[PDB]
């Protein structure tokens, strides 16, 4: 995250970290939606142009963390992967549409004050909250600038942007399955998700039930915290039929 | 081309 600030303990209990076994490296972020299902970006697990293509084996998910680094002794929980599920129609060559993947934990995690799950929106909340101007929460352990990493999980609140503006900032073929957020040039407030952030969540808090809903997945962009530019996120709502298909197919 | 048009996966 660029232009954001230090999270607060237990402020993002569904914040999950996708970790590399060896080389032991952090590769992305993701969120917890049940005690055995984790959501992330497909490109976190499979992105050819990088010769990326991991298996439920090369990886580990670390749950309940604050430090980017310390082993948080009674506080974190290390988990193994059962199956990884990439969207049958996730396009990496062209626009990164349907940048989404589910991962089933070999074992269900035990909720705590630092571990608990975010909610996925229903039709109605999507219309309510997904409106140009409304703000979102994007948390990550990603870069502190386009071109380091924080000591602690970072948070930045940003507003959804209007379709046409999104389309006007980039040459990429923006689809119905993504959304854009960050400030406009004329608004003089910044912040954006940067590298090490995809998979991580874009959440909003309903004024109706006071629950956090996951409205997007940190996906992609041109640069980071660039005037005239917008962070792009996967439309969680939009791709729910599939999340739901694979879930009550392969777990729960 | 995400890459070609400058695409920055994160």
């Amino acid at each position: 995250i660029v232009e954001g600030s230090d999270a607060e303990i237990g402020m993002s209990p569904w914040q999950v970290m996708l970790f590399r076994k060896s080389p032991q490296e952090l590769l992305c972020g993701a969120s917890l939606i049940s005690d055995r299902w984790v959501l992330t970006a497909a490109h976190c697990l499979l992105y050819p142009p990088w010769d990326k293509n991991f298996t439920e084996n090369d990886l580990l998910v670390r749950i309940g963390k604050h430090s980017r680094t310390r082993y948080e002794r009674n506080i974190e929980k290390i988990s193994m992967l059962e199956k990884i599920y990439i969207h049958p129609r996730y396009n990496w060559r062209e626009n990164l549409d349907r940048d989404i993947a589910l991962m089933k934990l070999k074992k269900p995690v035990a909720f705590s004050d630092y571990i608990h799950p975010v909610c996925l929106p229903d039709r109605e909340t999507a219309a309510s909250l997904l409106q140009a101007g409304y703000k979102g929460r994007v948390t990550g352990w990603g870069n502190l600038k386009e071109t380091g990493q924080p000591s602690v999980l970072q948070v930045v609140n940003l507003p959804i942007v209007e379709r046409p503006v999104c389309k006007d900032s980039t040459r990429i073929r923006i689809t119905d399955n993504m959304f854009c957020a960050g400030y406009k040039p004329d608004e003089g407030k910044r912040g954006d998700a940067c590298e090490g952030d995809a998979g991580g969540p874009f959440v909003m808090k309903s004024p109706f039930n006071n629950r956090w809903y996951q409205m997007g997945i940190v996906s992609w962009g041109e640069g980071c915290d660039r005037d005239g530019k917008y962070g792009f996120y996967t439309h969680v709502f939009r791709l729910k039929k599939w999340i739901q298909k694979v879930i009550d197919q392969f777990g729960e | 081309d995400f890459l070609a048009e400058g695409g920055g996966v994160r």
Binding site: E8, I9, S34, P117, L120, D122, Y213, K240 | -
Partner: protein
């Protein structure tokens, strides 16, 4: 699971559950008026 998720999803043990808020959730609420 999914579709408006979990059951208790969205309610954080250290915040909404003990009816206290974070340093900046209000900025969201205000973004929605």
């Amino acid at each position: 699971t999914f579709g408006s998720g979990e059951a208790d999803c969205g309610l954080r043990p250290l915040f909404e559950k003990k009816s206290l808020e974070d340093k900046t959730e209000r900025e969201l609420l205000e973004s929605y008026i």
